[PDB]
Amino acid sequence: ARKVTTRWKITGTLIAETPLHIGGVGGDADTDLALAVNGAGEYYVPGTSLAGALRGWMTQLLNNDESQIKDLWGDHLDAKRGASFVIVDDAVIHIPNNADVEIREGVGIDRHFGTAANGFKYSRAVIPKGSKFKLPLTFDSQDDGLPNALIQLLCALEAGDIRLGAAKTRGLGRIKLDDLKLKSFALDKPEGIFSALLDQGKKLDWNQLKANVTYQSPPYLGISITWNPKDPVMVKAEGDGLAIDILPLVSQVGSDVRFVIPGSSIKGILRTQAERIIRTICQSNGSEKNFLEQLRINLVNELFGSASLSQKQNGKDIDLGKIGALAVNDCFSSLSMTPDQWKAVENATEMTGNLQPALKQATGYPNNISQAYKVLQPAMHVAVDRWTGGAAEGMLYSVLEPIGVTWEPIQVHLDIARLKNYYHGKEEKLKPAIALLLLVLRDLANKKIPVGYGTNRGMGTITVSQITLNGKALPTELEPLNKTMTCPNLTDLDEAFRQDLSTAWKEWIADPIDLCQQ
Amino acid sequence: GIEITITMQSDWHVGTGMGRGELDSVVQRDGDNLPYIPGKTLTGILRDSCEQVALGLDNGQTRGLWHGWINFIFGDQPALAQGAIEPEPRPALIAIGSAHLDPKLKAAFQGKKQLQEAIAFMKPGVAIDAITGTAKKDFLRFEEVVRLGAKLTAEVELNLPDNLSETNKKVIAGILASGAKLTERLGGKRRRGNGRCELKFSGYSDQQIQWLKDNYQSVDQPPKYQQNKLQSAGDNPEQQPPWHIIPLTIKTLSPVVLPARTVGNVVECLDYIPGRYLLGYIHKTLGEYFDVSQAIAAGDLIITNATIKIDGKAGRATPFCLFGEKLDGGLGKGKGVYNRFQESEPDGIQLKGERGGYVGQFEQEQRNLPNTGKINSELFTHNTIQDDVQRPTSDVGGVYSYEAIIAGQTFVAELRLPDSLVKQITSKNKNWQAQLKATIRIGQSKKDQYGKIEVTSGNSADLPKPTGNNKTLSIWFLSDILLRGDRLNFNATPDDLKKYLENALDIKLKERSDNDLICIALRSQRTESWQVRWGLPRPSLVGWQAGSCLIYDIESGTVNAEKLQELMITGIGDRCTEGYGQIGFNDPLLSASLGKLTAKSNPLPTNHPTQDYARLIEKAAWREAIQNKALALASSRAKREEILGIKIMGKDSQPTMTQLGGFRSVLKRLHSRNNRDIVTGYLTALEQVSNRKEKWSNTSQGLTKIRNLVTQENLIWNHLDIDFSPLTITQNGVNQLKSELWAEAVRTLVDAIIRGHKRDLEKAQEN
Ligand SMILES: [Mg+2]
Ligand SMILES: [Mg+2]
Ligand SMILES: [Mg+2]
Ligand SMILES: [Mg+2]
């Protein structure tokens, strides 16, 4: 057979740090986009999908070097290489107790009218946060020891730097490894070959390998925005309720439900303002374009990403698609409720009756409604008929406004390595993209970007208290970004740095080329 | 007596380059159309795991004492030879069959074409561009994977040497138990999680491995190989008339490869079993009663070819004097067949000569074309892995195909023995024809996936008795005739054949002179074949094909039917003992004029272990049936109105699409029947508000129809109106699956109807 100096079984627990979606073939009558299930109908991570996530990250680590990647993950082309030395099994996903697959609604908002675009309504099934699955790796070493790149991979998993499945830029897919265990079988020797058959192998201390390497995280800029709602902030739930028509969206996070603003929603508001800035500068109208063409404008194609779209642009055939270098996480409330405590709110039927006990429960003031209604407050609204006054027949509706829910800081992750690859390495070309991003954040802090439902109707305006910029391995001319900002107008960034960015930005405004066009 | 049992622990893929429908790659499926593991996959995988074990015991030496043991058990790999090897290659001791699903489960599938598809599902796959992070052009595939939890079992045979010491038997068992336990994966995409398995031998456990662990340091070289030489006695009686004819019926229990020729990388197959393949079974069964090897040398024994059974008898190779209408006739059409030994070509219409296949019986007033038999055959494609790259490569050939006769075909041979040899046997065993029942392996690749056949003996048949017509003598070659020229090479000619019969029968023959009637219709044949005892190919045998015909006018003398009978028994020419030379005189199918004629599951028991696996397959077949039927029912506006009361009236929708959407959002919460409180609660609150109830006026009772569909548990199944009998295999499966899938069927049908409504509403709108 293939000679193997040692077989390493490398195993542990992977946990979903944000909701996952690994897609099947798609569609399931319940949702438009449907989770992969194994032949027993259990949700699982295909080893193809996990193996590609790992091979992908190593390729970004080894600077897209083929030569070393093929020596781990194998090849078909080279006469010397063939089959993969790393083996990745299928792993079933165990969803937390009582928890279940969630459906996330999605909409595309027409950039001209500001309203849902026709046809752009979809829904996605997602594995809730905190679900677990087994890490199922085997490695057949032909040399002695363990490859350092394979050690860096396991360090990256423990750091949670790998994302798996769909919608990776829009909230989903982060996984982190726990309980890593390493079993070595010295298959080259009789004592080792019988160990494989009987003794269940030789333990290695991971901490001893983890001590012999420095984990080289790739360039990124983390942005943490600390904020609180100035007007109630919510994303609307999937459908009308009983006592309350409009209820906030919530998600399972382990034992408790929390209110959630999806990263899809925070990404979408940021993208919209970024585009409006670019189109404003160019005075480029958006009104004659359909929604898929409205989205497709300069710099945002690299930051927020573009749809795959093959084009025979010049007899040469090219793909316009690229992933977003900017990714956004789901933002959850600090407040939490047991799953049944919220089911009592969803199923209240009298706004002054059995709803009042339910909100007193969930808000954590089970005996004090006047404090309960400082957290979640039911509102009633009428449409008033313009000739008669009073109220228009049928037009009475109510909202459960999360007036006082406190929210955790928003995490935006900017992949500087991915942009720099788009610009074929030229870090000069980052400054227009970094300049745009800082202008978007300036508006966020100036209440120019409201979030969630009903922004024009008494909701959605946020106060930003602090933006923390925390990049790793940034190029030296972007190193001034590492800052905590509290002035909305960026005055905490060095004026020489803000003036440098302004210069590269103004030089792009004077000629707004496709900046990744080499 | 040994089996391998395989428990598949993840979804698994095997065997085929072809792809059928919207799937790109499809799994290997057996004769029941059910997925299975081919015996060559199983051997190759198990060998590979035993190779890892031996490679460890040799301390990584790629050649050594323990790789000798692998070559002992699994046979040598010629075509891995790196230098001069003087001994002939050893065959394997271990034969491993194909692994099939549980036979009682396989019976439940019979005819249920929709269920046979549901054993697998599409797995998507995409390849992603590393710099952009988006799917590469071309790099999309959808792949068939069989559901995990399949438990499959294979027959195994260890035909150990007649002398192996008990220490060595324990080593063999030790290695096989060790290699089985080291085996963890098989099939395609192993390295990516497909095809995880448990492979276990019957009667080998950790005790077999533990003995090896305790003793491997003591182990010697394997015993040397030795051929099973023949042994003669010379003691047979002289051959004396009569000749007994014992029909042997062969039935294929697995595909049989009978090499006709290799073209490129595909081995082509015969559509009959040559008699030489049965001499090994004749040696096995009768060589204890008389000297079978002397009987062959004396010609006291004939085993004919096995040809497809028609009319309860051996099918006879189609005579080349038959010609079919080229446009739309011949035996495949069942009309427009002319016997050109007796009929002129009709005016105008051109004919094609018959070229193959077999005909059943025919009688001198048949009034019908003779029954024509066909042999089914299948192409099996294999690969050879180069062990270091673990993929096939040019240095090891890597792709090849066998045509094979598929399973369930039935063939009839005849063993002929002179009376003196039946006396020899019957003096020793009165029941000797009972010993002719056997299961044996014949062909190419006989030791694994291919070649398993049943043999059954019939009762002694009557000797053929041809008509002694003194006007014409006509000869049908029922088998290939090999003649030697007067130089003892095979370059004989049809004039040598005239002299052979002329001399053999004591008659003079001349070609019939009728200008419209063909007298001779031969084709040349060449047989290239190995001989296993020699270890070298046979001398090339040249002759004329079966089906060849010729007819002679008898010039002088008289032909004797006694001698025609004897030649019809013993045949003519070389190697008649293998059934060459078998011939038919004056058969009326050559004599007749033909142009006017025309041709003539049960459920799994409730306690059954696989009942849990069958339930996974059924739900898949039910879900797709419900989805398909829901699509059809939404397509017609009368049915959406029947089922939910919804309708289109001009440009208007009843109710508004918003009202349908509101209902639908609630029905999303109908996960179980005990959630029907949720949906009925919505409807009562709707029904209580006057302005909202009237939104659904001008529907056909829509609110009651929804109330019924949700609260009457029988009603969804009556609207879907699916015959679930072809979709279920578990006993009590129908009532169980109905209760389980109820809420999903309601959600699916309502989802389909509202979609179909909206996209017809768009048409009325856009007028
Ligand atoms: Mg869909
Ligand atoms: Mg109400
Ligand atoms: Mg293509
Ligand atoms: Mg395809």
If you write DSSP's letter for every residue of A172-232 in order, what string do you get?
Answer: --BEEEEEEEEEEE-TTSHHHHHIIIII--EEE-HHHHHTS----PPPEEEEEEEEEESS-
Cα–Cα nearest to A7, from A139, A188, A147? A139
Of A40, A51, A192, the CB nearest to B56: A192
Rounded to the nearest angstrom, the minimum Cα separation between B221 and chain A is 17
Three-state DSSP at B513 gives coil
- Interface contact flag, A83 B391, Cβ < 8 Å: yes
Residues facing residue B530 across a β-bridge: B537
Backbone dihedral angles phi then psi of residue B380, each to the nearest 5 degrees:
-110, 125
Q: Considering only CB atoms, which chain B residues are within 8 Å of A41?
A: 616, 619
* Beta carbons of A57 and A153 less than 8 angstroms apart: yes
Cα–Cα nearest to B53, from B39, B40, B41, B70? B70
Task: Return the residue matching tokens 């709110």.
Answer: A345
Rounded to the nearest angstrom, the minimum Cα separation between B305 and chain A is 42
**Distance in angstroms between the alpha carbons of the first and the last residue of chain B:** 75
Three-state DSSP at B18 gives coil
Which of left, alpha, beta for B557 (phi over 0: left; psi -120 to 50: alpha)?
A: left
Three-state DSSP at A452 gives coil
Instruction: Give resolution in angstroms.
Output: 3.0
Distances (CA, A) of B451 to B106, B211, B282: 22, 35, 17
Question: How many Cα atoms are found within 13 Å in the side-chain-facing hemisphere of B630?
Answer: 22
**Residues ≥6 apart with Cβ < 8 Å to B119:** B34, B35, B146, B147, B617
Task: Return the residue matching tokens 């070659």.
Answer: B477
Backbone dihedral angles phi then psi of residue A163, each to the nearest 5 degrees:
-115, 145
Rounded to the nearest angstrom, the minimum Cα separation between A180 and chain B is 20
Residue of chain B whose Cα is closest to the Cα of A44: B10
Based on the number of CB atoms within 10 Å of its own CB, is A344 exposed (0-12), middle (13-18) or buried (19 or more)? middle
* DSSP 8-state code for residue A145: S
Q: Is A322 on the interface with B (CB under 8 A)?
A: yes
User: Cα torsion at A62, A64, A68, A69 (round to 10°)?
Assistant: 100
Residue B24 marked in a binding site: yes
Can the peptide bond before residue B223 be classed as cis, meaning omega within 30 degrees of 0?
no
Q: Is B146 on the interface with A (CB under 8 A)?
A: yes
* Beta carbons of B42 and B99 less than 8 angstroms apart: yes
Of A30, A238, A319, the CB nearest to B132: A319
Ligand closest in space to the Cα of B140? 4
Q: Which residues line ion ligand 4, judged by CB < 5 Å?
A: B 24, 141
Structure tokens at A256: 């408790």
Total beta-carbon pairs less than 8 A apart between chain A and chain B: 169
- In terms of DSSP bridges, do strands B266-269 and B399-405 run parallel, antiparallel, or are they unpaired? parallel
Q: Is B196 on the interface with A (CB under 8 A)?
A: yes
Structure tokens at B180: 């089985």
Cα–Cα nearest to B735, from B725, B746, B750, B744? B725
- Interface contact flag, B665 A239, Cβ < 8 Å: yes
Based on the number of CB atoms within 10 Å of its own CB, is A96 exposed (0-12), middle (13-18) or buried (19 or more)? middle
H/E element, A68:
helix A66-73
* Beta carbons of B278 and B413 less than 8 angstroms apart: yes
Strands (E), B304-407: 307-310, 313-314, 316-317, 322-325, 337-339, 351-353, 358-359, 372-373, 377-383, 385-386, 391-392, 399-405
- Interface contact flag, A39 B691, Cβ < 8 Å: no
- Interface contact flag, A190 B53, Cβ < 8 Å: no
Structure tokens at A22: 């690994």
* Beta carbons of A462 and A451 less than 8 angstroms apart: yes
Q: Considering only CB atoms, which chain B residues are within 8 Å of A79?
A: 389, 393
Cα–Cα nearest to B696, from B659, B666, B746? B659
Cα–Cα nearest to A301, from B134, B135, B129? B134
Q: Distance, CA A398 to ligand 2 centroid (Å)?
A: 9
Buried b (16+ CB within 10 A) or exposed e, B676-715: bebbeebbeebeeeeebeebbeebbebbebbbebbeeeeb
Structure tokens at B621: 């077949």
Q: Considering only CB atoms, which chain B residues are within 8 Å of A74?
A: 191
Distance CA(B175)–CA(B181), nearest Å, equals 10
Residues facing residue A411 across a β-bridge: A224
Q: Distance, CA A26 to ligand 1 centroid (Å)?
A: 7
Of A3, A38, A196, the CB nearest to B60: A3
Three-state DSSP at A167 gives coil
- Interface contact flag, B62 A25, Cβ < 8 Å: no
Residue of chain B whose Cα is closest to the Cα of A303: B132
Rounded to the nearest angstrom, the minimum Cα separation between B124 and chain A is 6
- Interface contact flag, A193 B210, Cβ < 8 Å: no
Of B142, B148, B149, the CB nearest to A25: B142
Distances (CA, A) of B600 to A401, B171, B313, B334, B369: 85, 62, 18, 9, 7
| Three-class secondary structure assignment of B216-263 | HHHCCCCCCCCCCCCCCCCCCCCCCCCEEEEEEEEEECCCECCEEEEE
Distance CA(A327)–CA(B561), nearest Å, equals 97
Q: Distance, CA B692 to ligand 2 centroid (Å)?
A: 11
Biggest CA pair distance of chain B: 115
Cα–Cα nearest to B523, from B498, B551, B499, B547? B547
Question: How many Cα atoms are found within 13 Å in the side-chain-facing hemisphere of B435?
Answer: 16
**Residues ≥6 apart with Cβ < 8 Å to A469:** A221, A222, A223, A481, A482, A483, A484, A485
Residues facing residue B410 across a β-bridge: B251
Biggest CA pair distance of chain A: 96
Q: Is A317 on the interface with B (CB under 8 A)?
A: yes
Distance CA(B59)–CA(B54), nearest Å, equals 9
* Beta carbons of B484 and B576 less than 8 angstroms apart: no
| Three-class secondary structure assignment of B329-356 | CECCCCECEEECCCCCCCCCCCEEECCC
Distance CA(B86)–CA(B294), nearest Å, equals 31
Distance CA(B284)–CA(B280), nearest Å, equals 6
Of B52, B681, B691, the CB nearest to A393: B691
Q: Please report, for chain A, how many H helices and E strands are present, in that order.
A: 14, 21
Task: Return the residue matching tokens 């050879």.
Answer: B384
Residue of chain B whose Cα is closest to the Cα of A83: B390
Q: Distance, CA A163 to ligand 3 centroid (Å)?
A: 28
**Residues ≥6 apart with Cβ < 8 Å to A394:** B691
Question: How many Cα atoms are found within 13 Å in the side-chain-facing hemisphere of A206?
Answer: 19
Task: Return the residue matching tokens 């024994």.
Answer: B301
CB atoms within 10 A of CB A131: 22
Breaks (C-N over 2.5 A) in chain A follow: none
Distance CA(B566)–CA(B564), nearest Å, equals 5
Q: Is A409 on the interface with B (CB under 8 A)?
A: no
H/E element, A102:
strand A102-109
Distance CA(B76)–CA(B37), nearest Å, equals 23
Task: Return the residue matching tokens 């000629």.
Answer: A511
Ligand closest in space to the Cα of A241? 2
Structure tokens at B411: 């063939």
Of B148, B213, B685, the CB nearest to A198: B213
Distance CA(B284)–CA(B438), nearest Å, equals 10
- Interface contact flag, B616 A40, Cβ < 8 Å: yes
| Three-class secondary structure assignment of A339-398 | HHHHHHHHCCCCCCCCHHHHHHHHCCCCCCHHHHCCCCEEEEEECCECCCECCCCCCEEE
CB atoms within 10 A of CB B430: 9
Structure tokens at A90: 């299928």
Backbone dihedral angles phi then psi of residue A223, each to the nearest 5 degrees:
-120, 120
**Residues ≥6 apart with Cβ < 8 Å to B527:** B480, B538, B540, B541, B542, B543
Distance CA(B246)–CA(B361), nearest Å, equals 19
Mutant choice from A193, A236, A354 vs B, greatest count of B C-beta within 10 A: A193
Rounded to the nearest angstrom, the minimum Cα separation between B60 and chain A is 5
CB atoms within 10 A of CB A382: 11
Distance CA(A166)–CA(B645), nearest Å, equals 39
Distances (CA, A) of B308 to B373, B375, B405: 7, 7, 11
Distance CA(B328)–CA(B3), nearest Å, equals 52
* Beta carbons of A451 and A261 less than 8 angstroms apart: yes
Give me the residues of B, 597-656, that contact A with CB < 8 A.
616, 619, 627
Give me the residues of A, 48-77, that contact B with CB < 8 A.
48, 51-52, 56, 59-60, 64, 74, 76
Residue of chain A whose Cα is closest to the Cα of B661: A239
Backbone dihedral angles phi then psi of residue A158, each to the nearest 5 degrees:
-65, -30
Residues facing residue B741 across a β-bridge: none
**Residues ≥6 apart with Cβ < 8 Å to B674:** none
Cα–Cα nearest to A106, from A265, A267, A289, A230? A265
* Amino acid at the residue A19: P
Look at chain B and count its residues: 767
CB atoms within 10 A of CB B648: 17
- Interface contact flag, A190 B59, Cβ < 8 Å: yes
CB atoms within 10 A of CB B641: 20
Task: Return the residue matching tokens 């049960």.
Answer: B602
* Beta carbons of A398 and A245 less than 8 angstroms apart: yes
Cα–Cα nearest to B704, from B718, B685, B721, B683? B683
| Three-class secondary structure assignment of A21-33 | CCECCCCCCCCCE
Residue of chain A whose Cα is closest to the Cα of B148: A39
Task: Return the residue matching tokens 């002289």.
Answer: B238
* Beta carbons of B106 and B32 less than 8 angstroms apart: yes
Structure tokens at B535: 């270890």
Structure tokens at B139: 């790099």
H/E element, A57:
helix A47-61
Distance CA(A269)–CA(A156), nearest Å, equals 31
- Interface contact flag, B10 A194, Cβ < 8 Å: no
**Distance in angstroms between the alpha carbons of the first and the last residue of chain A:** 47
**Residues ≥6 apart with Cβ < 8 Å to A299:** A274, A278, A432, A433, A436, A515
Can the peptide bond before residue A402 be classed as cis, meaning omega within 30 degrees of 0?
no
Residue B30 marked in a binding site: no
Give me the residues of B, 201-240, that contact A with CB < 8 A.
206, 209-210, 212-213, 216
* Beta carbons of A215 and B227 less than 8 angstroms apart: no
- Interface contact flag, A41 B128, Cβ < 8 Å: no
Distance CA(B664)–CA(B739), nearest Å, equals 22
* Amino acid at the residue A423: Y
Three-state DSSP at B450 gives coil
**Residues ≥6 apart with Cβ < 8 Å to B532:** none
Rounded to the nearest angstrom, the minimum Cα separation between B414 and chain A is 47
If you write DSSP's letter for every residue of B78-137 in order, what string do you get?
Answer: TTS--S---SPPPPPSEEEEEEEE-HHHHHHTTT-HHHHHHTEEEEEEEEE-TTT-SEEE
